C-alpha cells in the first residue's frame, strides 16, 4: 500500500525499488502576448527516477518537441512519464528490474499501473511522505544537462556522490532529503550555504561538494537552521 513514516526503513532493504517523481516533466513559462493575452512556452523537463538504496538516478530528459501539437499537456505528461518508466524497466535485465515503484504523487498511479500491466509482479505504490524531489532542478549539474538537451536523452547519475563509502543508505537519503528540502524552501540561502566557501569544490564526477565528515555536520546544521527560520516565519515563530 502507501509508504509513510511507519514503514520508512523498507526503502533501505534489499528489494530493488525506485521512486518516480513527475513534478519536472512538464515545465512552462507563462507570458503576455502582443494582444495582451497570456500564453505558455514549454521548456525542457525531466523524470526523476531514483533508487534510494544505491543512489542510482535515471534522469530521463523530456525535450520540448514531445509536446508539439499535443493537447491537454498536464494529463499527457503523466502518461508520458509512465511510458518512459515502463521502457526503462523493460530495458533492464530481469535481476535489475524493481520489485516496487513508489510514485510521489497519486495521479501517477493509474498511468503507471496501466503501462506496467505486462509486469504483474511489480507493485505500484503511493507515499504519504512529502518528499522534496521537485527541487532536483536546483542541483546545478542536473539543471544544466536538462536545459542543454536538444533531443530526448537519458543521463545516469549517482545522487549520493561517494557518500556510501562512509555512511549508510539510510543516512545518505536523510542528507539528500535535507539538502533538497532546504533548496526548496529558500534556494538562494541553500546554495550560499553550500558554495560560500571557495576551497571546498565539487569534483567533476560529483553533484555536491567534497565535504569532510565534520564539514557535513556543519552544513547539515546550517540547512536545519534555514528550514526552521522559514517554517517558523510561515506561522510567525
Amino acid at each position: 500500500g502507501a509508504m509513510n513514516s511507519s514503514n520508512y526503513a523498507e526503502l533501505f532493504n534489499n528489494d530493488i525499488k525506485l521512486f518516480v517523481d513527475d513534478t519536472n516533466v512538464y515545465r512552462v513559462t507563462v507570458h503576455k502576448t502582443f494582444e495582451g493575452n497570456v500564453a505558455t512556452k514549454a521548456i525542457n523537463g525531466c523524470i526523476f527516477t531514483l533508487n534510494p538504496k544505491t543512489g542510482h538516478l535515471f534522469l530521463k530528459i523530456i525535450h520540448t518537441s514531445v509536446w508539439a501539437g499535443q493537447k491537454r499537456l498536464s494529463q499527457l505528461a503523466k502518461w508520458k512519464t509512465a511510458e518512459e518508466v515502463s521502457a526503462l524497466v523493460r530495458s533492464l535485465p530481469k535481476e535489475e528490474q524493481p520489485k516496487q515503484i513508489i510514485v510521489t504523487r497519486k495521479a501517477m498511479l493509474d498511468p503507471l499501473e496501466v503501462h506496467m500491466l505486462d509486469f504483474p509482479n511489480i507493485a505500484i505504490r503511493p507515499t504519504e511522505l512529502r518528499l522534496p524531489f521537485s527541487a532536483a532542478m536546483s542541483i546545478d549539474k542536473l539543471s544544466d544537462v536538462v536545459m542543454k538537451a536538444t533531443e530526448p536523452q537519458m543521463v545516469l547519475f549517482n545522487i549520493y556522490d561517494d557518500w556510501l563509502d562512509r555512511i549508510s543508505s539510510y543516512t545518505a537519503f536523510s542528507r539528500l532529503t535535507l539538502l533538497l528540502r532546504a533548496l526548496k524552501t529558500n534556494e538562494e540561502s541553500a546554495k550560499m550555504i553550500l558554495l560560500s566557501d571557495p576551497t571546498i569544490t565539487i569534483k567533476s564526477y560529483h553533484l555536491w561538494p567534497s565535504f569532510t565528515d565534520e564539514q557535513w555536520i556543519t552544513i547539515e546544521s546550517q540547512m536545519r537552521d534555514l528550514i526552521l527560520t522559514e517554517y517558523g516565519r510561515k506561522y510567525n515563530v
Binding site: 509512465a82 511510458e83 493509474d110 498511468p111 496501466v114 503501462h115 500491466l117 505486462d118
Partner: protein, 300 residues
C-alpha cells in the same frame, strides 16, 4: 396465459413474481399463480418469514415446460420442479383453478414495465451465466458469487457474467495505453461487442439480467456487473447512436422500478455522477438523468 402451481405452502413466506410481491401464511391454502403472460421470461422469488437471510428464486420461461413449486422440508426451501406428464399437470392445474386457490398475475391496461425491464433477457442465454444443465429454469440467491469475484469459491454455484476489468490487458492495447484507458471504445466495440456478446442486444441482456439479480436478490456480484456495463458504455467516446438511445430507455425503467428505500445501497454514487456529469455520454441519457435528478437528487 400459463400457470406455476404450488404443492402447498407449509412455511410462511413472501413470494415475488417479477416486480410484484405478496405474503403467504404458514399452511395457507395457496396453490400458486395463474394468468402468467406467455412470451416473456419470468422470475419467481422467495423470502422466508422466519429468516430474512437468503432471498432465492427461479428464472423460467413457460414456453419451455410445465413447472411447479414444492417445499422440500430437508433442504428447507421452495423448489421449482418440471412435470413431464402434461396430462397430470393439466389435471392438477384445472383442480386448483376450479377451487380458486391460485392468485392471478395482474392484467392492467396501462403497463409495459416488465417488458421494458426484460427486453433482451432470454432463457437459453440465462443458462450461459447460471450453469445447471439438467434443468430448464435457473436458480439464483443473494449469496452467489460471480466468476470475477472468485478471481479476487465453488464454481458450480457461481454467476458466469462477462468479466470486465478496465486495468487489464484485454482492455488496453499495447502502445495505446492512455488512449484506451481514457476512451474505452476499443474495449466496448471490438473486444466486447464484436468479440464476446456479438451484438448490442446481447450486451443489453446481460446488463438487464445483472440489474434484476441485484434488485430481487441483493446479489452484490450482480450489482457490480450492472454498474461495470453502464460505465463501459458511458466511458466510450464512440458508441452507436441506437445503443445510446436504448441504454437511456433501459436505465430509465430500472431507476423507475428500484425501491426507493434501497437506492442508497443499489446505486453507486461514483459511477452515476461520473456517467451523468463527467463522461463522454454525459449529454446522451436525457430520460435517465431526468428521473435520477427528480427521484434521487441526494445521490448526486
Amino acid at each position: 396465459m400459463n400457470t406455476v402451481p404450488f404443492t402447498s405452502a407449509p412455511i410462511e413466506v413472501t413470494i415475488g413474481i417479477d416486480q410484484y410481491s405478496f405474503n403467504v401464511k404458514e399452511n395457507q391454502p395457496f396453490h400458486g399463480i395463474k394468468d402468467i403472460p406467455i412470451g416473456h421470461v419470468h422470475v419467481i422469488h422467495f423470502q422466508h418469514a422466519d429468516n430474512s437471510s437468503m432471498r432465492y428464486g427461479y428464472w423460467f420461461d413457460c414456453r419451455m415446460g410445465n413447472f411447479y413449486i414444492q417445499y422440500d422440508p430437508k433442504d428447507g426451501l421452495y423448489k421449482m420442479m418440471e412435470e413431464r406428464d402434461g396430462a397430470k399437470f393439466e389435471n392438477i392445474v384445472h383442480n386448483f383453478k376450479e377451487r380458486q386457490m391460485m392468485v392471478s398475475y395482474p392484467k392492467i391496461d396501462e403497463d409495459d414495465t416488465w417488458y421494458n425491464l426484460t427486453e433482451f433477457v432470454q432463457m437459453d442465454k440465462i443458462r450461459k451465466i447460471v450453469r445447471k444443465d439438467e434443468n430448464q429454469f435457473s436458480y439464483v440467491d443473494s449469496s452467489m458469487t460471480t466468476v470475477q469475484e472468485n478471481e479476487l469459491s465453488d464454481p458450480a454455484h457461481s454467476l458466469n457474467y462477462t468479466v470486465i476489468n478496465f486495468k487489464s490487458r484485454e482492455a488496453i492495447r499495447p502502445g495505446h495505453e492512455m488512449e484506451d484507458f481514457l476512451d474505452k471504445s476499443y474495449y466496448l466495440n471490438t473486444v466486447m461487442l464484436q468479440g464476446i456478446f456479438k451484438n448490442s442486444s446481447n450486451y443489453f441482456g446481460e446488463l438487464q439480467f445483472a440489474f434484476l439479480n441485484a434488485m430481487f436478490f441483493g446479489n452484490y456480484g450482480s450489482s457490480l456487473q450492472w454498474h461495470a456495463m453502464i460505465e463501459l458504455i458511458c466511458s466510450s467516446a464512440t458508441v452507436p447512436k441506437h445503443m445510446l438511445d436504448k441504454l437511456d430507455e433501459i436505465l430509465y425503467y430500472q431507476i423507475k422500478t428500484l425501491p426507493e428505500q434501497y437506492s442508497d445501497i443499489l446505486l453507486n454514487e461514483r459511477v452515476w455522477n461520473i456517467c451523468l456529469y463527467s463522461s463522454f455520454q454525459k449529454n446522451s441519457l436525457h430520460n435517465t438523468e431526468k428521473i435520477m435528478e427528480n427521484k434521487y437528487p441526494e445521490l448526486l
